[PDB]
Structures are given as C-alpha cells and as structure tokens.
Amino acid sequence: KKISGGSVVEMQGDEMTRIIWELIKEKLIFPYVELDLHSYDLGIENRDATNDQVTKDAAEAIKKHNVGVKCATITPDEKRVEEFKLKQMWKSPNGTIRNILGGTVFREAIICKNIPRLVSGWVKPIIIGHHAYGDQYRATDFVVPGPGKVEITYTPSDGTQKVTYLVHNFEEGGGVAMGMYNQDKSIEDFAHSSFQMALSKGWPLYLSTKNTILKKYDGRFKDIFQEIYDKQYKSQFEAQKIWYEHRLIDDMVAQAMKSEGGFIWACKNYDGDVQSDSVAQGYGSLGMMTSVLVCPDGKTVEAEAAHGTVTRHYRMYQKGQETSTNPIASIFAWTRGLAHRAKLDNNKELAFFANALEEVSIETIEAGFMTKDLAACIKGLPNVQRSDYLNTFEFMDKLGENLKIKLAQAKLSL
Amino acid sequence: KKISGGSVVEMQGDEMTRIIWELIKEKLIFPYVELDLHSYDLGIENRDATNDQVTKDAAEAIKKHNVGVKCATITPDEKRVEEFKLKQMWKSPNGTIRNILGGTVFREAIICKNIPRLVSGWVKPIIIGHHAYGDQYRATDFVVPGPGKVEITYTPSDGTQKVTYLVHNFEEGGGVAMGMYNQDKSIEDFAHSSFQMALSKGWPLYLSTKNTILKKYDGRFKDIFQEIYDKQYKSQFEAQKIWYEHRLIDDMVAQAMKSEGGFIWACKNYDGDVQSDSVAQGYGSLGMMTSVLVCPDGKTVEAEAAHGTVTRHYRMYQKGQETSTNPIASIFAWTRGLAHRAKLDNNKELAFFANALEEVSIETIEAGFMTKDLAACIKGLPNVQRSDYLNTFEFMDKLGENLKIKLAQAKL
Ligand SMILES: NC(=O)c1ccc[n+]([C@@H]2O[C@H](COP(=O)([O-])OP(=O)(O)OC[C@H]3O[C@@H](n4cnc5c(N)ncnc54)[C@H](OP(=O)(O)O)[C@@H]3O)[C@@H](O)[C@H]2O)c1
Ligand SMILES: NC(=O)c1ccc[n+]([C@@H]2O[C@H](COP(=O)([O-])OP(=O)(O)OC[C@H]3O[C@@H](n4cnc5c(N)ncnc54)[C@H](OP(=O)(O)O)[C@@H]3O)[C@@H](O)[C@H]2O)c1
Ligand SMILES: O=C(O)CCC(=O)C(=O)O
Ligand SMILES: O=C(O)CCC(=O)C(=O)O
Ligand SMILES: [Ca+2]
Ligand SMILES: [Ca+2]
C-alpha cells in the first residue's frame, strides 16, 4: 500500500464473485493503494445474521462517504432459504441500496478490439441509464388464496378523502396481486441525469415506455421527460445536433437491435435491469460491462458489477474444478469507484491508478490473454480448448503482472 | 373465388397495416378463396364511433367461429386522442381481445435462407409463448396527486378478515401507483400450453421470471409450472431428451442472445410482448414473424401481425411518397388462420392454399424480390440502392403472380 485512497465503502458479496472480489483486493488494489475502508459483508450469511440490517447500514455509509463498490449478492427465493437455512426470504440488497440512495444506474459495455460481438451492427457504445428507484423492486405482492376482491386505495395525508380503485374481483379460485409506485421527484432527477448524460457524450437520448398500455403510470415518465426537455435542455441538444425522442419499448428494443449504437437509452427500472443484460451479452459478455449508480446530488456514487454471483461456476469451484469467470466487471466496480473518489478529493495519484487498471485490463485481453467467455467470442464455444484461455486465477495473475509493469513504468517516466 | 373457406372473423386495422390488409384480400386471398366472413372494423374511427363495443363484439365472434385474423391497430395515448378527436383514450384492442379469449400467444420468426441475422448464433428458431391474460394489460394505474398513503387490500368472499398492505406512504410530492393481478387457472393453462408446445416441437422449454424480486407474484408462475411439470410432462420430456428449466429473466435474455436457438421460451405477458420484438428484429425484420393466440379450448385461434401500424411509413404514404413496408407478417396472419380453419373443417384444399401462400412468400424473397428492410439485412442499410428492393405495391404484385403460378402449376 502506497497511494492514499481515502474513504471507500466496500460491500462483500456471494459465491463466485466473492472469490473474485478477494483476489481483486489482494492482487490489484491493496498492494498499491491505502484505503480507509468501511467494509460491510453482504454475503447471504451475514445478511441473515443481521436481519438484513448490514444492508441498510452499508447504504447509509455510502451516503456518508459518497463512494461504494459492491460485489454481486444472492437475492434469495425459497430454494435459497433451504440452501442456507435462512430465517426469511430477504429482499435484494441492490433494491434496498438503490431505493435508499436514489438516482440513475448507468451501464455500458467494456469494449476490446479483438472480441467479436453477437450483434453485428453495434460499432458504437449503447449507454443505458435506468431509474434506480421504485417500481418492481419496491413492489408489494401477495398470493390471492381464493375468491374475493382486490382493491387499491389512495388516502391524502390530510385524511379528507379516499379514492378506491377495483384491481380485480376473483370470482373462482385464487391468483396473485401486487401494488407498485414511483415518485415524481425521483422521476425528475432521472430525466435530468439522462439529459445531462446525453450532453456529456454528445449523443441522442431515447426514453422507452409502455405509455399506450399504462397511460397514467408510464405517461407520467413521458410527460416529465418532455416538460424538462422542452424547458431546460432542448436548445442545448440542438446546439450539439442531437435530439430526445420517446419510443414505445416495443419499437425501442428493435431499433437498438438494428442500430449502430452511439445513443443514451433511458429505461424504467425493470427494463434497464433486463435490457442491460441483453446489451452486455450482445457486445459479447456479461463480464464486460460497467454499472454506476449516480445519485441526484452528483457527489455520491455506487459502482457495482451488474451481473450475478455466477452460481454455476461457483459449484464447479466447490468441486475443485477449474473455473474461468470474467472478473472485468467486478474490477471496473473498483476502478470506477476509486476514480470518483479521486475526483472528489482532487487526488491525481488515485485517478491515475484507476485509469491505469482499466487500461491494463483491456490491453491484457487485446494481447490474447482472456477468460473462457471471451475466447468463446473469438472462436466458437464448441471450438474452444483449454489452451485458448486462462482460468480465473491465471487471468487475475496476468492482470497483476501487467499492472505492476504499468505502474513501474509510470514511476520511471517523466 | 373458388375454394370454400368457411367462417373466419376479420378485424380491420389502422394506418400502413390497414392499406396492406386490403391489398392482401384483393390480390392474394379473395381470387382463390370464398369465405363466410364476419368483418369487424377495429380502425380507430369505428372504435371511437362504437365506444369500443366493436372490439368486444369481434372477440365474442372469435369465440363463436373459432378463428380470427387481426390487422394491427392504434392504441391511443393523449397524442392520438388529439389526432383523431377521440372521445376517450381507448384501451388496446389486443389487450381486450386477449383477456376475453385467454390462452398463450406464440411468436416465431419467418426465416428466409438468404437473409442474414443481426444475432450471429441463432441457426434454429426461437418460439416465445407468452401468457395472454392479465398483468399490465389488466392493470389499474393512476396519478398520485400529493402526499398520502397508497394501500392494497384483499377482501375475501368467505367473510373472513380483510387484509391491507401499505404500498407506499408519499411523504412529499406525488407520483404514480398501480395494481395488477393474475389468476391461477390462467397460469395453469399457460403452463400446459408451454409444455405441450415443447413436446410437439421436440425442444427444451424455459420459463423466465423475476421471482427473486416479486417473490409471491412471480413465484406463483414458477411454482405452478414446476408442479405441472413434475406431475404430468416430466417423463415425456425425458423420453424425448428435452428438459424444462426456470431461469431468472436477466440470465434468460443473455442465454438467448448467445444461444444457437431451438427452444421454447415461456414469458410473462409483458416480457413476451417486448422480447418478441427483439427476437423478430434479431432474425432481421419485424415484418417476418408469426403471432398466433392459442386459446385454452384447444379449438379457437387468433392470428395477427405482432408489429404495429407502422405510422412512419404511413405518413410517407400520406404524402404520395414511395414506401417499402413488409407485408409478410400480415399475410401470415391470413395463412395461419386459414390453416387452422382448414384443420377444423378438415378442408384439404384450404389447407393446401394456406401452405402455398407461405411457400410463395418465402420463395419470392429467396429469389431476390424483397422490401427495403430485407434488402438492408443483406447489404446493410447505407448500401441499399433502389434496384435492391420493391415498393409495397410492387412486392404485393410479385407475390400475386408467383401465387397465381404456384396454384396453376398445382392444378396439374
Ligand atoms: N448485481 C447483483 O447483485 C445480481 C444481479 C443478478 C443476479 N444476482 C444473483 O446471482 C445469483 C445467480 O443468478 P443467475 O444464475 O440467474 O445469474 P448469474 O450469476 O449472472 O450467471 C448466470 C450465467 O451468466 C454467465 N455469467 C454471468 N457473469 C459472468 C461472468 N462474470 N463471467 C463469465 N460468465 C458469466 C454464466 O454463463 P454460463 O453458465 O453459460 O457459463 C452464468 O452461468 C442469484 O442468486 C441472483 O439473485 C445478483
Ligand atoms: N399488434 C398491434 O395492434 C400493435 C403492436 C405494436 C404497436 N401498435 C400500434 O402501432 C402504432 C405505432 O407503433 P410504433 O410506431 O411504436 O411501432 P410499429 O408501428 O410497430 O413500427 C415502428 C417501426 O418498426 C419498423 N417496422 C414495423 N413493422 C414493419 C414492417 N412491417 N416492415 C418494415 N418495417 C417495420 C419500422 O422501422 P423504421 O422506421 O426504421 O422503418 C417502423 O418505423 C401505435 O399506435 C401502437 O399502439 C399496434
Ligand atoms: O438484485 C437482484 O436480485 C438482481 C439485480 C440485477 O439483475 C441488476 O441489477 O441488473
Ligand atoms: O396492443 C398494443 O398496444 C401493443 C401490442 C404489442 O406490442 C404486441 O402484441 O406485441
Ligand atoms: Ca440485470
Ligand atoms: Ca410487441
């Protein structure tokens, strides 16, 4: 440890990403960077032991220190309750954190020149901002056990009126029902971040909704974006020869699929969650994408890997079999977090380190050293041989070597 | 107008699809087929005129006659209300029809061997069955004007305690809120249709949900599928060497993107709606896809194009400008409906005709006569010249001749 990093909130995860997380710290961060590290273990076991209170604490710590880096976590269902002998099916730690912090989640592929895409046309990046607050992650769902009436009601805080809407009358048998909601202020912040991101990149902005189907719910997003565009941002867009356009999600996914890339895609929370996986895989790997939650203040960020804990690879790890799991997304959670840390503190040595590690990661892959997913992009999956890639440790070690070299050359330079 | 078709419900649409619809009847269907045809105009003007009653009437007619073919329709938002001077913002006719009929919507790309895909890997078809009932199409959404409590309650029919849950307490400002629901029986029918489709195609089946997030709501879909699989179709799958698996939707879309295709994808209503467009475009055009609603009765069917009315091309049509818009999906709405009609009536002539029109459509494109979208698939869009594609009228004409030849050559 030499560079003085400052205050960072670290959230430990589960399964294969927890393995990779420790390797990143040991071989990449800790040798070169001293951090005041506020560490919260979001491993499923510690969440169960704390009644998921560690998750709320971690989110409050991020508010305090303005940067956090999160490892992927298990969101348990019934099967996970049985697997770990959990007390309850805990809520997604990502939902909990994003709903405490608010803001927009920006996701973008990590491009290496030698890696063929699955989608032939994307020669420019697609950047998905997605609203981080509300909707399905805050929803209230339940089983309808039998016949009866489901209603949803709104009571203003003065208690002077009540509006009851019929959801469904279940005449025969049961089913499921759910309420969900969003807030105007959170929607307004989301539009601002989306418009500002478009201007920062010089790219057109598209917002996707279902507003033809949900006329009030999605119509509110469409209206808030349009009001804020026509008032504040529309001339700035024209000055850069870019535009803002609302599209139906149906049209939007087809346009993106056939596009060349090079646009900002504003998504509702659920669409951004799902489409970012399609996009990341389309550029060739879920392991090559960045995800940063940018809070409305412009000060606080949470960087993360958007993919999951890679359970299938973890099961092989548990048997001693070789794994090749792409660490790049998890590494970029650290570099994006430290880069923001550096900016807040005007720390040039940290800013240099964060970019250096990003450069090493891409250069290493472009020199032919990669995990199996990326070799599968170059070859076909059925054509890949063991000699074509590196196991998770071998790849981390190669990154470690090249990082030491790159930082050694920087010190020698000038 | 020789072959006797039987009874078919026709639903007329809007904008560019409406133009193509009448061309298909004139140049393709009516010369070779006589039908007992119950026509319902779902064009946005007639729906307004009838206060949407025509949409429910058409759905009731499909229940009666077991087959319908639907042109794409406008679902109005505020901008459409002003455009057409509408009385109300009408609900989607597709939502209305699907929730009356129930069942599963099956969507599959129409493959021409000369058309390159956007997605490198898919050499086998992807069939999305999607639940036709409930969820977002049946939702109750509203604006929250200001601070206050939104709650959701369940009052059982047995007189027992009413159950109340807090949705959100808005502490400052307003927002939006929505209820939505689904029914056990509809989910069970959706499960059975999915398992049977996989066995009939010999392909593995995947169900995608968000059940880690919606634990009760999406958990019910996952539990019902798993229960019906274990007790009913499991041994049949193993005999055919296929399998059923639930995946989270995040994993599923990425798995699908990198696959070679060749599976049935069971989706919830909203996911199937959206993913079907991404899959159709990935095989290279929104114009090449079949969409067939299969009702739980095993009898009734509604065939449609899954895409919209193509407003942008319609606006150019309104200016007298040349357009190239892909009719194939609107045509396959006709062929799929007639094919089902022919199966119900055991009409071997109608069945032959329906297949022939499909073969003609594919063979025409495979010969190099295609609309602009398909030309763009081959050459890339910036490289497409005018000599590479036929305009919408030209393309319909070329299909009409190849059809006339294919049936005359079959007269032998
Ligand atoms: N950000 C988050 O905290 C987050 C997000 C999503 C899911 N999860 C959680 O993760 C757990 C597992 O979910 P899941 O199995 O649906 O999905 P997953 O962990 O994302 O992995 C599913 C598949 O995606 C591929 N993959 C994902 N990340 C990869 C990487 N870094 N390198 C190489 N391949 C990668 C692998 O494909 P192959 O099998 O073909 O090799 C893997 O088997 C669940 O408990 C879920 O709740 C967490
Ligand atoms: N089944 C239905 O009744 C249905 C389904 C969806 C939407 N709609 C309705 O249709 C209206 C417009 O929707 P939208 O503009 O979002 O999408 P759309 O009408 O489906 O088409 C939008 C874009 O998709 C491409 N496209 C769709 N069909 C095509 C075809 N047959 N041939 C060539 N290209 C095709 C065109 O791309 P390019 O612009 O690049 O040429 C078009 O501009 C709305 O009122 C909506 O409610 C109806
Ligand atoms: O939190 C979860 O359960 C999944 C999160 C996810 O898929 C995402 O953030 O893209
Ligand atoms: O009914 C609508 O408004 C849209 C329908 C749609 O996009 C679909 O059926 O896939
Ligand atoms: Ca996701
Ligand atoms: Ca659709």
Curated annotation (Swiss-Prot), chain B:
Role summary: Catalyzes the NADP(+)-dependent oxidative decarboxylation of isocitrate (D-threo-isocitrate) to 2-ketoglutarate (2-oxoglutarate), which is required by other enzymes such as the phytanoyl-CoA dioxygenase. Plays a critical role in the generation of NADPH, an important cofactor in many biosynthesis pathways. May act as a corneal epithelial crystallin and may be involved in maintaining corneal epithelial transparency.
Reaction equation(s) it catalyzes: D-threo-isocitrate + NADP(+) = 2-oxoglutarate + CO2 + NADPH
Protein's name according to its UniProt entry: Isocitrate dehydrogenase [NADP] cytoplasmic
Similarity field: Belongs to the isocitrate and isopropylmalate dehydrogenases family.
Positions carrying Phosphoserine: 387
E.C. no: 1.1.1.42
Site (Critical for catalysis): 137, 210
GO molecular function: cadherin binding; identical protein binding; isocitrate dehydrogenase (NADP+) activity; magnesium ion binding; NAD binding; NADP binding; protein homodimerization activity
Disease: Glioma: Gliomas are benign or malignant central nervous system neoplasms derived from glial cells. They comprise astrocytomas and glioblastoma multiforme that are derived from astrocytes, oligodendrogliomas derived from oligodendrocytes and ependymomas derived from ependymocytes. Genetic variations are associated with cartilaginous tumors such as enchondroma or chondrosarcoma. Instead, alpha-ketoglutarate is converted to R(-)-2-hydroxyglutarate.
Residues where substrate binds: 75, 92-98, 107, 130, 210
GO annotation, biological process: 2-oxoglutarate metabolic process; female gonad development; glutathione metabolic process; glyoxylate cycle; isocitrate metabolic process; NADP metabolic process; NADPH regeneration; regulation of phospholipid biosynthetic process
